[PDB]
Symmetry: C3
Subunit: 125 residues, 3 copies
Amino acid sequence: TTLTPVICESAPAAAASYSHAMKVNNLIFLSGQIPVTPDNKLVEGSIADKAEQVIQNIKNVLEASNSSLDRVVKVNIFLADINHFAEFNSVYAKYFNTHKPARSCVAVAALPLGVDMEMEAIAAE
Amino acid sequence: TLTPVICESAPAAAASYSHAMKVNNLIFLSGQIPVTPDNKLVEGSIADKAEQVIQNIKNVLEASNSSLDRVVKVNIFLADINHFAEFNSVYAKYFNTHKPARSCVAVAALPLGVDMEMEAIAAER
Amino acid sequence: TTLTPVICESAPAAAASYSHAMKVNNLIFLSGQIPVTPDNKLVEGSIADKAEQVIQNIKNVLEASNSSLDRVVKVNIFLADINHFAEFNSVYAKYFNTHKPARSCVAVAALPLGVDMEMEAIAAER
């Protein structure tokens, strides 16, 4: 069993002591991503703009991990407000169309930096 | 290779996701809520709702060539922490001799305003 | 595929029908740990004191599962109050310095026994 951390510059710097992803053999566990740009600026706009940045962050981490969106196995979504469900789902369906990972989604009390959502994922190398 | 699982006996997915996704020997199941396979919200007690949730999970496991006794980890999201004990007493009917690792938290809200969401990870037969 | 439940005597007794950990071949899934002593008493004190007990519980479960902190793959943190983020992170950083697992952290509405945090993890066996 080999453990290989992943840290990529095209994703926001970790807000605490964690790698962007950790590979255990061929399985990749990705850290939760929030709507922050690679240069660490909070995303402004709509829920669509925010979700778009979150998935781009995930996409970039997957690339640095020798994986891709098409190789995502499971995704967990945490929303700051359950009413943002449909708007998030729309951007989500844009990236997961032909390939549909398993998924869970819940509305939590609050997220780091007061953001609207956090998304984590597990993918195959 | 990643193998998607579509379960005809489970409620239709609320977003762009498969009921489960298999990667090698592991199965990642999507979050299930107290909704009948005819896609109607379960009305009644926490025990009644818990029963439907686990039944949906059981059905998905069967469709993924797995079973309750092969579940490795379960994550429970409650809409109200006070439902903990009652939920636990129904949960014990399905996981008694076989006890998966588990986590349980109470979140702010869940899709469709339901009282709980359960996801899991299992080993293929 | 071999599934091996792990019973950790030095961790708080399971609050429901679950194992402290479950090993599936070389991967280990750990149950959510809360700030309770091995003697089932709820830790009283600072966020740091609670964070220390949760990480020690996780440490003991890792040991019982033939693993270690430096073999942790992913950690998920659930806080009862997002404002405890910084204090929790400070303690967390002590145990995950050279080795930094993937991680997620969210604040939820409430946790079992009314505690302030719950930590689960996935680790690799030695």
